């Protein structure tokens, strides 16, 4: 067992998480009426750690379609309307022990 | 200073984050051509810790519009087509020292 763990709905962090969640639900709803918690049937919490990778990368369009092999070292386009380049900023959230990675943020401006 | 910290683009976690990010960029692009890193201009990493709150909550629609006061203790609707209830599951990602909260996951089924 390495999963979540029960917590009383009294504990303040729960209390704040709940109000937050409910706030967000109402904010996103199309209902003109306000909804609120009727009953918190179960509350669990879990401390997690991960690593954010913040990459500032320059990307170039290669000459290879995504349907061919050897894309890793494939030649960049150099022709007039085919060549494109972009400066990008990536944020990857990694949780090592789980082997997972998540693209948290991603923007690119064609330079 | 409590922000990110430089890392060589050699370090494997960076290397994996980069391939991941680039993979995700290509996957989401409308381009038939494959793009790849031209140059990693900057690489930084940062270890973060937070708490996931996992709430299983039953919500009820109140009689108050979102434009009035005292929504916290506002009466639930009980009339035929106005009363609604929903069982929901919320995941809130909190980063204590920063006072931030994020709604990571959210589903509700009108029961
Ligand atoms: Cl851990
Ligand atoms: Cl920390």
Curated annotation (Swiss-Prot), chains A, B:
Phosphoserine: residues carrying this PTM: 8
The keyword Protease belongs to this UniProt entry's keyword annotation: no
UniProt keyword terms in alphabetical order: Age-related macular degeneration, Amyloid, Amyloidosis, Disease variant, Disulfide bond, Glycoprotein, Phosphoprotein, Protease inhibitor, Secreted, Signal, Thiol protease inhibitor
Tissue: Expressed in submandibular and sublingual saliva but not in parotid saliva (at protein level). Expressed in various body fluids, such as the cerebrospinal fluid and plasma. Expressed in highest levels in the epididymis, vas deferens, brain, thymus, and ovary and the lowest in the submandibular gland.
Motif (Secondary area of contact): 46-50
Function statement: As an inhibitor of cysteine proteinases, this protein is thought to serve an important physiological role as a local regulator of this enzyme activity.
Protein name: Cystatin-C
Organism: Homo sapiens
The encoding gene: CST3
């Amino acid at each position: 067992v390495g999963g979540p763990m029960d917590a009383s709905v009294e504990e303040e962090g729960v209390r704040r998480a709940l109000d937050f969640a409910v706030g967000e639900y109402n904010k996103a709803s199309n209902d003109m009426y306000h909804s609120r918690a009727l009953q918190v049937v179960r509350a669990r919490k879990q401390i997690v750690a991960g690593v954010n990778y913040f990459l500032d990368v320059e990307l170039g369009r290669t000459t290879c379609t995504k349907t061919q092999p050897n894309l890793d070292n494939c030649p960049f386009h150099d022709q007039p309307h085919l060549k494109r380049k972009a400066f990008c900023s990536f944020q990857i959230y990694a949780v090592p022990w789980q082997g997972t990675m998540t693209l948290s943020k991603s923007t690119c401006q064609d330079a």
